[PDB]
Design a protein around this ligand. Structure first.
Ligand code: QKG
Length: 347
């Protein structure tokens, strides 16, 4: 028996459609499940509107982390700027049957559902540009010194459309987020979108979100993840296929450098030796983003050949921005303010 019967064996609240909570919220259905807990669709009888309620797991570790998400959401929402409207709005929170419940504004489906709806053909470069500009503005908001918030889990699933037929988006799931000073985890971000500094076990800052954004934007247009690693070793090697060996000044400071690389006598770094002449990856830096995007061959897989807004000039700008987002060095990786000035966004 878990939580007097209200919970399942995974600390989740057993959702029952049609249940009414505190004579206010009418639970319609389950929207999604995550490590944090479940999000349900519910009607707020008081305010007479539809809301999304995130039911946090009934477990100390998850409750304590969700309390941080609340602190950060309330801190962002209080700030007055139009940029704050790229972050989902937390209306209120409450405890119910030993679950912390977060009430959010209702949104539409996420960018992964959007990709799946195109059968993973990818969205247009113009739509990608719209998402990129909004995301860069959102990251600029998080970078404001008073906030200095690191989302730490940017991915298609955590970027939602406000309206199913409109391009406006908002960022969700700040549970794993932290502030620049208060970093408390080492293994963070979803693997496909994890930055090299996190893979290498080095200290991280807001630049890790810019890395994830670069990965996301490419996936949005091509329809498949740029670095689809099955584990950390596979992830690092897939990054190396495209960007080459990380610079020595980074690896020389990386605690986990020898999980993926080895230092030669002449001081240079190379990938760890592979036994028995097994070939599993393209040589470092040979998987060109120029070809992944189809810059001069009509877009990803030639699917955008003879389409408006998919000129080579457009792709060369897109490629340059992505490569500046995928800089190995977090100190030189493009920052939101300057990314927004990139020619890719010129009117
Ligand atoms: C639909 O409106 C919404 C509105 C707000 C949120 C929200 C706020 C915080 N964290 C998460 C995971 C949130 N989700 C998850 C959806 C997952 C999905 N496939 O739609 C939301 C959804």
């Amino acid at each position: 028996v878990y939580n007097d019967g209200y919970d399942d064996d995974n600390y989740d609240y057993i959702v029952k459609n049609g249940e009414k909570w505190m004579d206010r919220y009418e639970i319609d259905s389950l929207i999604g499940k995550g490590s944090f807990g479940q999000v349900v669709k519910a009607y707020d009888r008081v305010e007479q509107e539809w809301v999304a309620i995130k039911i946090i797991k009934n477990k100390k570790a998850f409750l304590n982390q969700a309390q941080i998400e609340v602190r950060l959401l309330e801190l962002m929402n209080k700030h007055d700027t139009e940029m704050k409207y790229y972050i989902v709005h937390l209306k209120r929170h409450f405890m119910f049957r030993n679950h912390l419940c977060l009430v959010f504004e209702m949104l539409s489906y996420n960018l992964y559902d959007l990709l799946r709806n195109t059968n993973f053909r990818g969205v247009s470069l113009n739509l990608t540009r719209k998402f990129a500009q909004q995301m860069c503005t959102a990251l600029l908001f998080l970078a404001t010194p008073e906030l200095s918030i690191i989302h730490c889990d940017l991915k298609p699933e955590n970027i939602l459309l406000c309206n199913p037929k409109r391009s406006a988006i908002k960022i969700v799931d700040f549970g794993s987020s932290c502030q620049l000073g208060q970093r408390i985890y080492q293994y963070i971000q979803s693997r496909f979108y994890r930055s090299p500094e996190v893979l290498l076990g080095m200290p991280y800052d807001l630049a890790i979100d810019m890395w994830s954004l670069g990965c996301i934007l490419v996936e949005m247009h091509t329809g498949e993840p740029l670095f689809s690693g099955a584990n950390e070793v596979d992830q690092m090697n897939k990054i190396v296929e495209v960007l080459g060996i990380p610079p020595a000044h980074i690896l020389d400071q990386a605690p986990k450098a020898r999980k993926f690389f080895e230092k030669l006598p002449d001081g240079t770094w190379n990938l760890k030796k592979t036994k028995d002449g097994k070939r599993e990856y393209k040589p470092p830096g040979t998987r060109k983003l120029h070809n992944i995007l189809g810059v001069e061959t009509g877009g990803p897989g030639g699917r955008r050949a003879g389409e408006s807004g998919h000129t080579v000039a457009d792709y060369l700008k897109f490629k340059d921005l992505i490569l500046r987002m995928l800089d190995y060095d977090p100190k030189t990786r493009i920052q939101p303010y300057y990314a927004l000035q990139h020619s890719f966004f010129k009117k």
